Amino acid sequence: LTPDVRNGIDFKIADLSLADFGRKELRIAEHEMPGLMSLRREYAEVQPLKGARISGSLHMTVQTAVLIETLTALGAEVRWASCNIFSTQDHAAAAVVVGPHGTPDEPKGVPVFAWKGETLEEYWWAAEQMLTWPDPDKPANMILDDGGDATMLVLRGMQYEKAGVVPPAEEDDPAEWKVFLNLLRTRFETDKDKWTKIAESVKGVTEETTTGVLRLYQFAAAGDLAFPAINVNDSVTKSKFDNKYGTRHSLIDGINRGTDALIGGKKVLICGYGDVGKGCAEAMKGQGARVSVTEIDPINALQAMMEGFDVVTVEEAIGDADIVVTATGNKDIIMLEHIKAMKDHAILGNIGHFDNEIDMAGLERSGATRVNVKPQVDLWTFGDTGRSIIVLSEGRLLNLGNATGHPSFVMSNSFANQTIAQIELWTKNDEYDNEVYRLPKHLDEKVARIHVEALGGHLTKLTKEQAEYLGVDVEGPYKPDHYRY
Amino acid sequence: LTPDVRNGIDFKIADLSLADFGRKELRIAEHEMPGLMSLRREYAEVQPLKGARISGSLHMTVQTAVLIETLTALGAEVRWASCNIFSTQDHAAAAVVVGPHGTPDEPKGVPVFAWKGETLEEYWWAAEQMLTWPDPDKPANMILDDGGDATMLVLRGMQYEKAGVVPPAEEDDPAEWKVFLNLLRTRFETDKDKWTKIAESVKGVTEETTTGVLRLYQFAAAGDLAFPAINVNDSVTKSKFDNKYGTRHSLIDGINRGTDALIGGKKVLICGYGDVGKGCAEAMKGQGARVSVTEIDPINALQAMMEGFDVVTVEEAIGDADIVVTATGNKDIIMLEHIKAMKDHAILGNIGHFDNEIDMAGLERSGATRVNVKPQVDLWTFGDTGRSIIVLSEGRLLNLGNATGHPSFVMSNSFANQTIAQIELWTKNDEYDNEVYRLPKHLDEKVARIHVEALGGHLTKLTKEQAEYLGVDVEPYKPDHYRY
Amino acid sequence: LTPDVRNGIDFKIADLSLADFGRKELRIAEHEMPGLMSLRREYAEVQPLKGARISGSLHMTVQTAVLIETLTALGAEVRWASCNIFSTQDHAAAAVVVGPHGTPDEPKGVPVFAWKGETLEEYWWAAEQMLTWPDPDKPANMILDDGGDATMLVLRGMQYEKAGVVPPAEEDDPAEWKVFLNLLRTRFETDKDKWTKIAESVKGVTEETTTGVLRLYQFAAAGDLAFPAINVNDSVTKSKFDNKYGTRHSLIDGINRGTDALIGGKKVLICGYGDVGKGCAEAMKGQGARVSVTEIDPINALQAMMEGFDVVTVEEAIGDADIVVTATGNKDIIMLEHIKAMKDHAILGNIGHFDNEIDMAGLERSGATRVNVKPQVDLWTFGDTGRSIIVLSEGRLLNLGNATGHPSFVMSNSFANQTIAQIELWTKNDEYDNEVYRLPKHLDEKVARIHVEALGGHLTKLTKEQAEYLGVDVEGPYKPDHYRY
Amino acid sequence: SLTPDVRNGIDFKIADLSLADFGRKELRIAEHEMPGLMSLRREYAEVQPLKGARISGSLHMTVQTAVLIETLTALGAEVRWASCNIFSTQDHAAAAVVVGPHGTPDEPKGVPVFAWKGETLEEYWWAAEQMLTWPDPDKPANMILDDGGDATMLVLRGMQYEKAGVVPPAEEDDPAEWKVFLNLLRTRFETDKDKWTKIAESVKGVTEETTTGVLRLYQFAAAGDLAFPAINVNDSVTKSKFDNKYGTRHSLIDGINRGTDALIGGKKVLICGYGDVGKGCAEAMKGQGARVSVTEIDPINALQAMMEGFDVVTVEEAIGDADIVVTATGNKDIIMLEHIKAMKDHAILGNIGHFDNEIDMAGLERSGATRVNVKPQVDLWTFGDTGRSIIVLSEGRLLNLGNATGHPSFVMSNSFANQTIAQIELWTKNDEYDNEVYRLPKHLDEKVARIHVEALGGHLTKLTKEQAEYLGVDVEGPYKPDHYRY
Numbered sequence A, C: 001l002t003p004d005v006r007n008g009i010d011f012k013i014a015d016l017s018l019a020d021f022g023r024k025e026l027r028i029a030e031h032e033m034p035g036l037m038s039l040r041r042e043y044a045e046v047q048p049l050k051g052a053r054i055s056g057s058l059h060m061t062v063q064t065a066v067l068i069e070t071l072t073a074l075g076a077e078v079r080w081a082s083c084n085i086f087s088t089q090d091h092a093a094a095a096v097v098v099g100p101h102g103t104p105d106e107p108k109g110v111p112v113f114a115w116k117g118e119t120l121e122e123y124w125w126a127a128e129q130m131l132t133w134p135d136p137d138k139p140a141n142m143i144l145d146d147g148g149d150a151t152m153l154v155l156r157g158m159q160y161e162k163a164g165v166v167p168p169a170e171e172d173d174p175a176e177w178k179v180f181l182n183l184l185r186t187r188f189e190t191d192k193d194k195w196t197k198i199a200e201s202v203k204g205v206t207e208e209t210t211t212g213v214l215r216l217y218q219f220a221a222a223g224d225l226a227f228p229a230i231n232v233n234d235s236v237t238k239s240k241f242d243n244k245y246g247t248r249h250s251l252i253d254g255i256n257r258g259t260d261a262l263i264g265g266k267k268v269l270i271c272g273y274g275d276v277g278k279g280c281a282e283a284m285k286g287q288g289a290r291v292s293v294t295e296i297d298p299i300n301a302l303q304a305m306m307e308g309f310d311v312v313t314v315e316e317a318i319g320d321a322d323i324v325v326t327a328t329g330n331k332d333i334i335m336l337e338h339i340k341a342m343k344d345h346a347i348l349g350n351i352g353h354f355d356n357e358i359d360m361a362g363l364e365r366s367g368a369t370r371v372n373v374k375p376q377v378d379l380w381t382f383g384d385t386g387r388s389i390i391v392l393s394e395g396r397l398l399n400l401g402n403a404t405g406h407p408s409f410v411m412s413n414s415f416a417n418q419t420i421a422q423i424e425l426w427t428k429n430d431e432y433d434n435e436v437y438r439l440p441k442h443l444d445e446k447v448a449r450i451h452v453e454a455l456g457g458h459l460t461k462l463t464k465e466q467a468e469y470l471g472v473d474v475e476g477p478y479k480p481d482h483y484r485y
Numbered sequence B: 001l002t003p004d005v006r007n008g009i010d011f012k013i014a015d016l017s018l019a020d021f022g023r024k025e026l027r028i029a030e031h032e033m034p035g036l037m038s039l040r041r042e043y044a045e046v047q048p049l050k051g052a053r054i055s056g057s058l059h060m061t062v063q064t065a066v067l068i069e070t071l072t073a074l075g076a077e078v079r080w081a082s083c084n085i086f087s088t089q090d091h092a093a094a095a096v097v098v099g100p101h102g103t104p105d106e107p108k109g110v111p112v113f114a115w116k117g118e119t120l121e122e123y124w125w126a127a128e129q130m131l132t133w134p135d136p137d138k139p140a141n142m143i144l145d146d147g148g149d150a151t152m153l154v155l156r157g158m159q160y161e162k163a164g165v166v167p168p169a170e171e172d173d174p175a176e177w178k179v180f181l182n183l184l185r186t187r188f189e190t191d192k193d194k195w196t197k198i199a200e201s202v203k204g205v206t207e208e209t210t211t212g213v214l215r216l217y218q219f220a221a222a223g224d225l226a227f228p229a230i231n232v233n234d235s236v237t238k239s240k241f242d243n244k245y246g247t248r249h250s251l252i253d254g255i256n257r258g259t260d261a262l263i264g265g266k267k268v269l270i271c272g273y274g275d276v277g278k279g280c281a282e283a284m285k286g287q288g289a290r291v292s293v294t295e296i297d298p299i300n301a302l303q304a305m306m307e308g309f310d311v312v313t314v315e316e317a318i319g320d321a322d323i324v325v326t327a328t329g330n331k332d333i334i335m336l337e338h339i340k341a342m343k344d345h346a347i348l349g350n351i352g353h354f355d356n357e358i359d360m361a362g363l364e365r366s367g368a369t370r371v372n373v374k375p376q377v378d379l380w381t382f383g384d385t386g387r388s389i390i391v392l393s394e395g396r397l398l399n400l401g402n403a404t405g406h407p408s409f410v411m412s413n414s415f416a417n418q419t420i421a422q423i424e425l426w427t428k429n430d431e432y433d434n435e436v437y438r439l440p441k442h443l444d445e446k447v448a449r450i451h452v453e454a455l456g457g458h459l460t461k462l463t464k465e466q467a468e469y470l471g472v473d474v475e476p477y478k479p480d481h482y483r484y
Numbered sequence D: 001s002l003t004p005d006v007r008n009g010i011d012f013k014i015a016d017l018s019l020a021d022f023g024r025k026e027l028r029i030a031e032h033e034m035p036g037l038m039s040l041r042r043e044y045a046e047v048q049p050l051k052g053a054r055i056s057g058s059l060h061m062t063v064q065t066a067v068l069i070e071t072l073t074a075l076g077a078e079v080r081w082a083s084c085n086i087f088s089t090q091d092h093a094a095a096a097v098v099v100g101p102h103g104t105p106d107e108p109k110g111v112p113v114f115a116w117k118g119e120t121l122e123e124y125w126w127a128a129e130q131m132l133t134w135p136d137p138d139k140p141a142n143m144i145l146d147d148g149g150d151a152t153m154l155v156l157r158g159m160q161y162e163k164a165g166v167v168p169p170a171e172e173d174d175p176a177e178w179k180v181f182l183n184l185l186r187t188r189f190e191t192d193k194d195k196w197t198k199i200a201e202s203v204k205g206v207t208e209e210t211t212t213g214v215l216r217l218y219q220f221a222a223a224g225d226l227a228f229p230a231i232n233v234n235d236s237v238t239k240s241k242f243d244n245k246y247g248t249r250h251s252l253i254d255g256i257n258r259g260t261d262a263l264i265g266g267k268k269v270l271i272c273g274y275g276d277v278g279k280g281c282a283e284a285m286k287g288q289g290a291r292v293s294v295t296e297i298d299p300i301n302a303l304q305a306m307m308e309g310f311d312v313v314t315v316e317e318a319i320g321d322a323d324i325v326v327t328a329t330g331n332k333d334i335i336m337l338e339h340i341k342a343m344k345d346h347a348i349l350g351n352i353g354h355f356d357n358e359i360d361m362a363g364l365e366r367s368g369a370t371r372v373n374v375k376p377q378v379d380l381w382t383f384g385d386t387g388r389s390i391i392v393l394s395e396g397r398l399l400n401l402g403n404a405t406g407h408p409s410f411v412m413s414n415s416f417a418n419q420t421i422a423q424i425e426l427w428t429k430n431d432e433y434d435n436e437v438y439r440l441p442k443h444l445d446e447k448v449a450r451i452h453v454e455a456l457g458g459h460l461t462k463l464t465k466e467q468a469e470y471l472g473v474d475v476e477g478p479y480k481p482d483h484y485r486y
């Protein structure tokens, strides 16, 4: 694989002729993303992101296209790739390359390396394209990450450079780990300090998802976080809105498009009851499902029980479930022995950021036979028991793989937060050390206020006497730092 | 257009090569349709529909496909068309023509005249193909109808043949009415008693939906119901499950695939609160929408308010609605004046059986301009205000237009009812007069019990003393007027 | 046990002094019962119930009080008793005897024989007083019944008079069957045709509840229904609102006042899923309960499953239920064997019309020991296992036992239905045979319209073209007779 | 002038000691629904961690609180109690606490309680002073257990006025309760000049149970006036996200039911505030078929309300259409006289926040509206100028405890397990604390949730070693980062 280059723009996508359809959907989404449109208006004259060379790794969807065109409206240059092999919306990839005033013959947009249905090798090739700016002396200077893959390639790449060697992989390492190290080992043959110089140049990363933020905390603990990070997942207007209400919308959409399976009346097992598992359980309850939940954390478990759900183990419940969904952010939730315990024509999916919640390696090597039904839907049959299971998106996050991910108006909260985090890190970069930060409460309130307004809600304004009573300013922030909402 | 013919089967569909894909979905659907599979097993030996020549007008979906193959398993011959221009699922139509054991080169299934995105003239052409059996002495002898268009073609066609003329249309008559009359008028130039002869041969009709049943009541009140009918829509296991729970599933699905618009937080206006409007409001509420409802019937309105929804008129709430769904079975619910009042980028769709709940004709001649976004999704802009509305399925039923209609496990209730009714009408035909009937309660209980078992529910069995106390048999459990 | 007499009114109640308190609540109920108030206004001049002498057997609550004073406003005379030993609200009984313009020393309302906490003997004594008008030439001429006990005393009583004997009770007939047969046998010693004369004089009965209507069909099938009946339970505005939304309100109220037990997080078993069971499950699910449902009817079971509830048997689920509610109208749902299987401190109650859904007789003779906690709440302990169960209302309907029954705005639908039925049977009496009838749909629609307006709902008016398309009158009725709403 | 009753050497003031048998039956039922407290009694029985503590507790004297007090004494503490609201006490539970599990009304074996349902303001502050004044002048209170901060306010303001040498006069337009509070302090200062200072000096810490009290603690700490360590129990995860939310989902509708019996389904309901209590209120009403709108100042909470299906509206625009109006803000001046006069005829008005000043009751009472009492804690106020009447619950005091019985035992077992642990931590590890507001470590909140999951029969999954390593947590927890919001 080699990049296409048209009118001086390098990229790799499914089909540039999808641009007109992508544009139409982008325009509809701008009307549903007031957080982004408000930032474009507010920062238009200032051009806060001038001089930024942002390397972005985030599902290449309609919603992300409105984010990329906000970063460029605000002065940044970007290069983009998806953070999952199935999450790209090819029409939005084409509209980003062509830009709002370009055409497929005369594209005026930005470099995108993303299509729906990548292989592992192609995913990592695309991530290196997205991180590799064309002037050796102007490498990337910011990262915008969802899941931490862009940050991992940079920091691991530098670690192996400083060690003088890319380790061999073990035979029993996951396939993707072998691909990742192959990419790094190969580049190190011909370029000995690429990643060190990129890490040096990067002024900060913004990280969008609970899984990526866990990895940031694990780099910071090891003394390896080489630039400041803003944990955007934990903006109040991201975690409590995207993770929860986003998933309430998009889980059932993925299930619907993949399977068309009636949800009402079915037993549904949701593994994990954090913000995503709360959204899943709310979606399924609302469609008439009989929902049970698994958990390791007794606080979240007590919430599930308070919300009308039994709290059970996968060992006890797996044989009775019609639909099983993993939502933990952890690995090894649904192992091969659990899959072989499922009832005939049960459905299995994962909505967590990575596919290793479901033992797909074990399933693929087990001797079960696969019939592909349609893209991202496979029927796996075990000849020993006779039973077949429907697996969505090969265990990758099913809302993006089987449908279109969260809706624009939800993503307007997450991406307003991301945009503000990118502005803060770029323009006030000296104020940040090499640690993980969260945005101040006032800026999350700012984001929520734009969306209340857009939905026609009417905020009450505190009187002077009331503000004094609460010990807050009339304009906020209104809550203490540890407030949980 | 003329029909295609291959291996002795006449048909008109989008693409035979889709049969493989459709067959994989049909097989998964069979595991989700225990009502139909239970009937295939029960009646396999008896072959109750041997001799039946069933003309079917019903959305050509994966679910219909399992129904069609249950009829043919039971001994019937069939010819099929969709009952809407956008509701066909092309891979299902291909699998039905090819059959379980056929191939696209050598198909071995049954005649289907159906594709997604028919024009009006093509829809009525296909309906005439579906009702026209190849041997003139063996015309259709049963109809299986959803919405009454097959029934109306036969009964109106006979009416004109008896009058000796097909009347002209009026200039202000609907476009679809002109097409319908053109078909009948054209045919009556070469064939003077085609529909009269079909009418005579048809032993009965089964009708699947609320709008179709109203039309049967209207034919029957005019003294024009020429053959018996079973109202399948009003089986308990149909109206209270398909119209309500089916729509709870498929309305969100249609809206999602057409628009990907967040439902939570939005103001949603549902017009009508019968079983389909009750399923729409339950779906929307479940996604966190702020739902209001319109209604003419004070009983249904009081239910909506007891279920946590304001009951408002279109005039008062149209200006602020983010999504508007018509679910009435009536006409003229969202007129052009209301559409001009909508907020920018609001969404408008209909889930009733016919498009005339929304004033599409008014919209198409208003001076608003259309941009097609993707199939069945159009953006209409009024330049005087600058505001745009997203219209789903050009006003046609959005769950089947924009998505896949109700899920198979729901359609298994409706289609087990329709298969029982076809059986009852065909094998006990002399017991029925020319009136509309509903299935006895015990046959509805039998369809419910197949699905409770499929879901793992555990029924209690009455003791002899309890059965005596209630005055029921241990095996129907409710009075005839019971409402569930 | 003899009636009290004051200012020309015979009555038996707890305490006349409660009349002021009762009257304040009656006045507030009148604002919440626009169905009854609209009927008082409508028929004020006509006086349609002039000449009626209505014997009423119906829970003597604040809601029934507004019904009683609507019947008297329309010209009827009345004599009343409760239809359950624990459902009376003493301050309502006192306001009804005193009247809107009386005082406790000089009452000016109507005969009431009802108090909360009757014995069985007192219950049947009161039922006889209510059915026994003072002038033997003017016996009762209508019955207004809820549960059919008034109707049963009249028709069985006549039945024994024509046989010339009241049959002896069997040793293992229920305690209340013996009481009932003792009343009739004692009266038959001094009066040989009392019940025969009342039955001849009764021109109609209106029957308010599912269990009463069932008994009406059983009388009718036997050839023994001596006068016309209107089944008020099966008014659309009764069954689908009182039985369902009434119960959604008053089930949790009963369990709250009896036990104050958290409902959220708890496993709750609802026996029966008709309109009452549907309201129970909806109330419990709304409080975060984990609800399962039992059923004999596959159609109601499939609804419960489609509404997110497992459908289980008592035997499978009884051991782990924290709250068990019987809602069937049948008998022998929770037997002694099931109660010994309950978890310690589980709560057991019945909301169907009669206590025999729960095997109280078996409990009372089991060797378990009772400790009364407060009125209508008892703790039963089995010393063999050490476990105790909380029993509400000694098995009698708990919403009225432990709390105040359905709220006034619900009872306004049921009681406008019952007032219209009394009007129709009394004024159009020649139109009816000795069969059970239901009110015409337009009278149900009229009752709904009054409450829609009271809540501020805004009905759409059909155009002439729309009414022609539907084949309906613009003024209704709007649905076919078999429509199920 | 009230004086304590003294029986068998126990000083108290309650409605009726003969209710103790009925109280005890309800306490023993509650022990079965309070596994958090029963587990702590078993765990710390032998240790007696609270020996030497003299805890002055100010918290709604309900059945649930009685199981908390008996947990504190089981663990070695001595106590003296009072309610933190004039209508919240459950007289049978007050009687059972004085009599104790082995005492009788003639021979009580319990502890000093100064609480009954229906106190006047004067009696409420008299009772608060009894609760804070231990009998040995040389053994004053050494811990405070507070809900709403009233006990902490009397001690800290009492000491402030002592150090100043004067209790300030009240302003004519000060609220009535403020005039009572200063009267109490001004009178005691006449005869005892250092009472509150010695108390403040003896108190080793306070635990504070509610969002209102915790605000007041932050306000003392801001001003340099928090004279001893405080633990904010409100903000334990298993308190704020359980009690505030699911407790209120149960008890709001209970209080509305017992006061009014008004159908909730089909009514328009206005909830003012969408924090944890307003979320519980809206979930309760939604589940009963109400049509709910929400008011809010905070755009984050408002956006959650809209995402959960509720319009976000101002009181000015929605007040005239509301059938029921509930305040759940913790602020003051939410529903003013002008808004009351705007309500529809026979609308219901109540407050569920800790203090009654959310509803302008002073303005209502001085307006010229006429009051008819319907029954305890239910009043019908009529405006002769408009002809409209409104039903007001609990004279504006928290309606779940005033009109019903407050949150259910099983919910309070979380709050009171937290409070009991907080009291153990502050008494036994006192040198580890400065004069600041603290929250309990996350591991202890997990411990409390786990007792309740187990009691409900939920089954927790156990992390494998590999999973624990992947997450970077211990298999035994804690499982979430410190800023985790659940």
Ligand SMILES: NC(=O)c1ccc[n+]([C@@H]2O[C@H](COP(=O)([O-])OP(=O)(O)OC[C@H]3O[C@@H](n4cnc5c(N)ncnc54)[C@H](O)[C@@H]3O)[C@@H](O)[C@H]2O)c1
Pocket (backbone or CB within 6 Å): B209, B210, B211, B212, B239, B242, B243, B246, B247, B271, B272, B273, B274, B275, B276, B277, B294, B295, B296, B297, B300, B327, B328, B329, B330, B333, B351, B352, B353, B354, B397, B398, B399, B400, B405, B406, C460, C462, C466, C478
């Ligand atoms: N799309 C689908 O999958 C699907 C499924 C089942 C039924 N249907 C169709 O949906 C439609 C409704 O079916 P149903 O079973 O709910 O019928 P219904 O008769 O039970 O309900 C329709 C409701 O609309 C109300 N109504 C009529 N005119 C109105 C007006 N002008 N404004 C407001 N409300 C009005 C009526 O009072 C009635 O309660 C029919 O056309 C039916 O054939 C579609």
Ligand SMILES: NC(=O)c1ccc[n+]([C@@H]2O[C@H](COP(=O)([O-])OP(=O)(O)OC[C@H]3O[C@@H](n4cnc5c(N)ncnc54)[C@H](O)[C@@H]3O)[C@@H](O)[C@H]2O)c1
Pocket (backbone or CB within 6 Å): B460, B462, B466, B477, C209, C210, C211, C212, C242, C243, C246, C247, C271, C272, C273, C274, C275, C276, C277, C294, C295, C296, C297, C300, C327, C328, C329, C330, C333, C351, C352, C353, C354, C397, C398, C399, C400, C405, C406
């Ligand atoms: N307490 C109240 O205020 C109140 C209100 C309305 C009705 N009622 C009473 O409630 C009872 C139920 O009324 P309804 O209108 O719901 O009647 P219903 O006939 O609509 O429903 C009862 C359900 O019980 C089911 N059932 C019968 N026997 C059973 C068994 N052994 N196990 C499981 N399920 C069984 C039936 O299948 C039926 O669906 C009647 O006694 C009625 O008079 C009480």
Ligand SMILES: Nc1ncnc2c1ncn2[C@@H]1O[C@H](CO)[C@@H](O)[C@H]1O
Pocket (backbone or CB within 6 Å): A058, A059, A061, A062, A063, A064, A083, A146, A147, A208, A209, A210, A242, A246, A353, A400, A404, A405, A406, A407, A411, A414
């Ligand atoms: N439509 C979408 N476009 C871009 N990102 C999305 C979309 N839906 C979900 N996500 C993001 O995917 C992340 C997990 O990789 C979540 O943190 C969520 O914000």
